[PDB]
């Protein structure tokens, strides 16, 4: 109906020391589950599970985001859309079990802020008080992205979630951690070499590399490297699109430019659709469990 409004209420009681220790929780278990998708980690999964539940708002309604905690996955993940992500889910369940207080919402964000973090990325300040919305779900159908499209279809997609060209630019650099897994989207190979570190090693590849547009197994026209590294339709439209490739060769050259663009555009996109009181908790910005000594 009318559109809604999400007011964040901090968890009865919690403060930044329990968040920092929901935020270890995390990290410890990302150190702990080494093997996950050969070697790689769970680190970037969760980053996409934090992008792909705040990504499915819409700023006309403010419907979906992160703030509900409450999702209506496609086939039940088996979608080209959003298959694999049933992995980050699995991931944060023992996580919620040890500290069933935090909200879904928070604790989906919270993963991806930690991932990010503890790959070596920028400090992400985070916010806590999404509220789980049990009977106002959210389906995933068609509210994300396709990757099969050109600049345009990116430009105009992203301006539902409110995002200008510098934050699309920004944000996409994320495709720098982890890999497209044929069997999950239909589309096969890492974007970069350092899988599970966060650096601003995708826009250097976008414009170091040669790139030569092909079927894979699936049949799907993805960008190949012959250093073994993709780039969906979508991340190369980033460099045909003369208002992206400025803003990709920004990145490419500027290392603390790119982190604290991420961040910020990062944080943003995890609180989009929320409201935040005036006398609400000041953002809370985690220590690494290397800042900790642990
Ligand atoms: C144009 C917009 C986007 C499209 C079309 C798009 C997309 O089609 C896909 C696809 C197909 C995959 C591969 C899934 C698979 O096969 O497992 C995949 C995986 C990951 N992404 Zn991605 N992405 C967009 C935006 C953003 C944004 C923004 C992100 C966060 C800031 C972020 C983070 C991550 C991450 C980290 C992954 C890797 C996941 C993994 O399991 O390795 N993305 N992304």
Not at 33 to 45: A, K, L, M, R, T
Not at 159 to 186: F, I, P
Not at 213 to 228: C, F, M, T, V
Request: charged share 25%; aromatic share 14%; hydrophobic share 30%.
């Amino acid at each position: 109906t009318t559109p809604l409004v999400h007011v964040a209420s901090v968890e009865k009681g919690r403060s930044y020391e329990d968040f920092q220790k929901v935020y270890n929780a995390i990290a410890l278990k990302l150190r702990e589950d080494d093997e996950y998708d050969n070697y790689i980690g769970y680190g970037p999964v969760l980053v996409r599970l934090a992008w792909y539940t705040s990504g499915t708002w819409d700023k006309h309604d403010n419907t979906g985001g992160s703030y509900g905690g409450t999702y209506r996955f496609k086939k039940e993940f088996n979608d080209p859309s959003n298959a694999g992500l049933q992995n980050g889910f699995k991931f944060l369940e023992p996580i919620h079990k040890e500290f069933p207080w935090i909200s879904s919402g928070d604790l989906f964000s919270l993963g991806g802020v930690t991932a990010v973090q503890e790959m070596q990325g920028p400090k992400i300040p985070w916010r806590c008080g999404r509220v789980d919305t049990p009977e106002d779900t959210t389906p995933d159908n068609g509210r994300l992205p396709d990757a099969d499209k050109d600049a345009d279809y990116v430009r105009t997609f992203f301006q539902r979630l409110n995002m200008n060209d510098r934050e699309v630019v920004a944000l996409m650099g994320a495709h720098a951690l982890g890999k497209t897994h044929l069997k999950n989207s239909g589309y096969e190979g890492p974007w970069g070499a350092a899988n599970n570190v966060f650096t601003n090693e995708f826009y250097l590849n976008l414009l170091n590399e040669d790139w030569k547009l092909e079927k894979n197994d699936a049949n799907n026209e993805q960008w190949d490297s012959k250093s073994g590294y993709m780039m969906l339709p979508t991340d190369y439209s980033l460099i045909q699109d003369p208002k992206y490739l400025s803003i990709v060769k920004e990145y490419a050259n500027d290392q603390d430019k790119f982190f604290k663009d991420f961040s910020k555009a990062f944080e943003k996109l995890l609180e989009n659709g929320i409201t935040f009181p005036k006398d609400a908790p000041s953002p809370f910005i985690f220590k690494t469990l290397e800042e900790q000594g642990l």
